[PDB]
Amino acid sequence: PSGVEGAAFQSRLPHDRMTSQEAACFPDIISGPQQTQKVFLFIRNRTLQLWLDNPKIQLTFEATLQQLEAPYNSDTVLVHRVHSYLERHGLINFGIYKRIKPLPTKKTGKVIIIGSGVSGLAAARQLQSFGMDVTLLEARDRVGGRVATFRKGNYVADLGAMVVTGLGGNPMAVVSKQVNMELAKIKQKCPLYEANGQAVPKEKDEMVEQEFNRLLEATSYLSHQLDFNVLNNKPVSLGQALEVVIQLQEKHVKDEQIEHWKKIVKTQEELKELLNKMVNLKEKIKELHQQYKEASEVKPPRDITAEFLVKSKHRDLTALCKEYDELAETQGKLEEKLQELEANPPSDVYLSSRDRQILDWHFANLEFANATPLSTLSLKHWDQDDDFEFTGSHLTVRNGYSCVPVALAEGLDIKLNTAVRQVRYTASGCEVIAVNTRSTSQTFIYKCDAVLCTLPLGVLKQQPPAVQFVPPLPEWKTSAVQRMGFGNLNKVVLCFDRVFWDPSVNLFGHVGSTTASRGELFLFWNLYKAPILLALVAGEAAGIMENISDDVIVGRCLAILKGIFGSSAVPQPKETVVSRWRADPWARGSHSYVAAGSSGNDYDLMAQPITPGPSIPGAPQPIPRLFFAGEHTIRNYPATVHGALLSGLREAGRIADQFLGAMYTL
Amino acid sequence: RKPPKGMFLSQEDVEAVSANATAATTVLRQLDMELVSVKRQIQNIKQTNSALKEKLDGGIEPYRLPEVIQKCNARWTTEEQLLAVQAIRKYGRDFQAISDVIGNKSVVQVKNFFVNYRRRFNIDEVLQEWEAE
Numbered sequence A: 001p002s003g004v005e006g007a008a009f010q011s012r013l014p015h016d017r018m019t020s021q022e023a024a025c026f027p028d029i030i031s032g033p034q035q036t037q038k039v040f041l042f043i044r045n046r047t048l049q050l051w052l053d054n055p056k057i058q059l060t061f062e063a064t065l066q067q068l069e070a071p072y073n074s075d076t077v078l079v080h081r082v083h084s085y086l087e088r089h090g091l092i093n094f095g096i097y098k099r100i101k102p103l104p105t106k107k108t109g110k111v112i113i114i115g116s117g118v119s120g121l122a123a124a125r126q127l128q129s130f131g132m133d134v135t136l137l138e139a140r141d142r143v144g145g146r147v148a149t150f151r152k153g154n155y156v157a158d159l160g161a162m163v164v165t166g167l168g169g170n171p172m173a174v175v176s177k178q179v180n181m182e183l184a185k186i187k188q189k190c191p192l193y194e195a196n197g198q199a200v201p202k203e204k205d206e207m208v209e210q211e212f213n214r215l216l217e218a219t220s221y222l223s224h225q226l227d228f229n230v231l232n233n234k235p236v237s238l239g240q241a242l243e244v245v246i247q248l249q250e251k252h253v254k255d256e257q258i259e260h261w262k263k264i265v266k267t268q269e270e271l272k273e274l275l276n277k278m279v280n281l282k283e284k285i286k287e288l289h290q291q292y293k294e295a296s297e298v299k300p301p302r303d304i305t306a307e308f309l310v311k312s313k314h315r316d317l318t319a320l321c322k323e324y325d326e327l328a329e330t331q332g333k334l335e336e337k338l339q340e341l342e343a344n345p346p347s348d349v350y351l352s353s354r355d356r357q358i359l360d361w362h363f364a365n366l367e368f369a370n371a372t373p374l375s376t377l378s379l380k381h382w383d384q385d386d387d388f389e390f391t392g393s394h395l396t397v398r399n400g401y402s403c404v405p406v407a408l409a410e411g412l413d414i415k416l417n418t419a420v421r422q423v424r425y426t427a428s429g430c431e432v433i434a435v436n437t438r439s440t441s442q443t444f445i446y447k448c449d450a451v452l453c454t455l456p457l458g459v460l461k462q463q464p465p466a467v468q469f470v471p472p473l474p475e476w477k478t479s480a481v482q483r484m485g486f487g488n489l490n491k492v493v494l495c496f497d498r499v500f501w502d503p504s505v506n507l508f509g510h511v512g513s514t515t516a517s518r519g520e521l522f523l524f525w526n527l528y529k530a531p532i533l534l535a536l537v538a539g540e541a542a543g544i545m546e547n548i549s550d551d552v553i554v555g556r557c558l559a560i561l562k563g564i565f566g567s568s569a570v571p572q573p574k575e576t577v578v579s580r581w582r583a584d585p586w587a588r589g590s591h592s593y594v595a596a597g598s599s600g601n602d603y604d605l606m607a608q609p610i611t612p613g614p615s616i617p618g619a620p621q622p623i624p625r626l627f628f629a630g631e632h633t634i635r636n637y638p639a640t641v642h643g644a645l646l647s648g649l650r651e652a653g654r655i656a657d658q659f660l661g662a663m664y665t666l
Numbered sequence B: 001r002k003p004p005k006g007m008f009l010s011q012e013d014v015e016a017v018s019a020n021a022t023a024a025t026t027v028l029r030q031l032d033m034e035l036v037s038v039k040r041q042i043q044n045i046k047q048t049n050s051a052l053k054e055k056l057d058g059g060i061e062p063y064r065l066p067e068v069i070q071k072c073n074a075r076w077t078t079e080e081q082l083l084a085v086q087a088i089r090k091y092g093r094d095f096q097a098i099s100d101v102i103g104n105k106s107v108v109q110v111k112n113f114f115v116n117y118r119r120r121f122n123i124d125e126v127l128q129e130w131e132a133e
């Protein structure tokens, strides 16, 4: 879209309707007359537009009111409320921008942020922007977390996040204007090459792909229409559902063959019954002919009974010769119907070996997309976030995605090599205990009003725990941590001296020979200026391939590539790197997912803050102290950089509302 | 509300393929064996019908007669009346058969004969003799 309505779209808001969050901050307006609502909506949309047209500089309330016309610039407090709303919740004045009003003289409140990934960094900027004292604690020797970029010489390649998934509605659109990201579009054409090294024929590639998509719709029919979501008191996975659907197609193939060969026997037994009729009738005809012959031996002149015998046997014989001729025509009709039937059999198989292997590539690609084996995904809910997907083509970050967190880190107080061990929270405040990752006896204590935890879901899941909470987290939180899925996905970076692949193709597949190994080195990316190829390890292969050494993995990569491009065309690589995200103790995996028996609701549960008990008995209901952001806390944009960013912006708004108050809600 | 084209999924079949650890592979072997036994019965009947066609070798060509053509004359000769009375005794009321035997009488002409000579050839008695067999 475009205009003020495009600004709503670009900020993930409906242009013509007030959201639930807006209703909470502006109950007077939404409960009030429909005319005032349109005024609110225009002010909001216009203010957004002004920010979006130039996100390189702060949009002040003054500048906003400057560019509003009548009747919209009538009520100046309404405009101030709307501006403050949008600012507080990070819809405007987020990321890296030049501030018109320098940061306030004195800081108010103190916040510790655990983790310096995008969710932490984005929250930290907002809180500092609102005038709070912020310190981030990071276990690694760098910022960015799961945004990790390999840099050696002029080779640049992302071992973590590398793709912006469309700019239409994406807050990373705004960040790409604020920071120089060399966004290059990704052409989606992806030729598949079988285990032998031979390309899959264009006709076959389409047949299998269409079947994959039909198999997926089929699982959705299973889920919604047949209600096949529990089986033996166990939630059904997407993988199970796909097996069941595939088995039923194999069954249908067999049922069609059965009723086809049943038509052949029914016809063959109809022919058998006709041929027996004809054998017996031919035997009667033979006998009756002899009798006519004998009656004709009696030469004339003859009495009338002897004449009658000749004439009546003649009649009887032609009557039987008629019958045989009719049966003989029916023999021809049944015999041609047998050639019809035998020439046109149904399908011999549902899927051949080559078909089923190519299909497993499409399943591997889906396992890459959800960063987990299909047997773990909830049938009902695996695609719950599809409706919020952005428009526009996907883009690669060509200069390395680390440029984003590094830019967000500027001006913030970040303690690197600082591993949080314990988080204490009481009615009076909080105490974060951390150690130095190098010399672990060296201990640090950080005292604060509030803790924002951006620890990954894999870390929160650790048993025995890496980080202890005092008091422990309540069961409603720990059960959500348990139920939520935390998948895995690895990359192999191959740096060469020269390009030996098609420079016009961004990606190409490799079909493995087994279902078990379908995710193993199944897809190669060509995204960078330098000659770099990136190989993916998805599905069940990701976890297994972490216990195999780099030399062996790189060897398997070259083996495959020699197969596609020829043995003398593929040199030994100059530099190689292999990610191991499940082994990494500050990650313990890659992406969250909706596991079978989880739902989108667990993402909301992850986002909910914790309020400690009262210090002394009968003291009033204390204030919320422990907050949660990160990839795994945002229902509509989970498992993404933009989701992490948004969750950070969310919590900064919630924390500031709490510890600085919200003047705009009156 | 409807599953995609060429995709087959019914409540009954889903319950049949689920509900055991190996209900799937049971149901699919059951149909493999049903298929092989139906193809058994085809090879069986093809050999039977192949033998029945050996016996029909020749057709009915050596046992066929020429057709005699003659104009439907309305004059009953004594010869033809005597042929009719015997044809009635053999065939009953099958007027078509009686006509074919006599050779030069239409089916209506035969039905007239039944009426005209009922008394004189005791056609009632001749039909009772036929009915008795």
Ligand SMILES: Cc1cc2nc3c(=O)[nH]c(=O)nc-3n(C[C@H](O)[C@H](O)[C@H](O)COP(=O)(O)OP(=O)(O)OC[C@H]3O[C@@H](n4cnc5c(N)ncnc54)[C@H](O)[C@@H]3O)c2cc1C
Pocket: A114, A115, A116, A117, A118, A119, A120, A137, A138, A139, A140, A143, A144, A145, A146, A147, A159, A160, A161, A162, A163, A164, A165, A418, A419, A420, A421, A454, A455, A456, A459, A466, A467, A489, A490, A491, A579, A581, A585, A586, A587, A589, A590, A591, A629, A630, A631, A632, A639, A640, A641, A642, A644
């Ligand atoms: C292989 C791979 C590919 C990906 N590709 C894409 C993509 O193409 N597009 C996309 O949008 N997203 C992608 N992602 C996802 C994206 O990287 C994450 O969703 C996002 O970066 C996570 O941000 P976060 O701030 O929620 O968590 P993190 O970035 O993990 O930040 C949490 C921080 O906490 C730190 N930490 C852990 N334990 C402690 C401790 N005890 N004390 C202090 N600090 C601690 C970590 O070191 C880390 O810095 C990918 C992820 C992986 C693994």
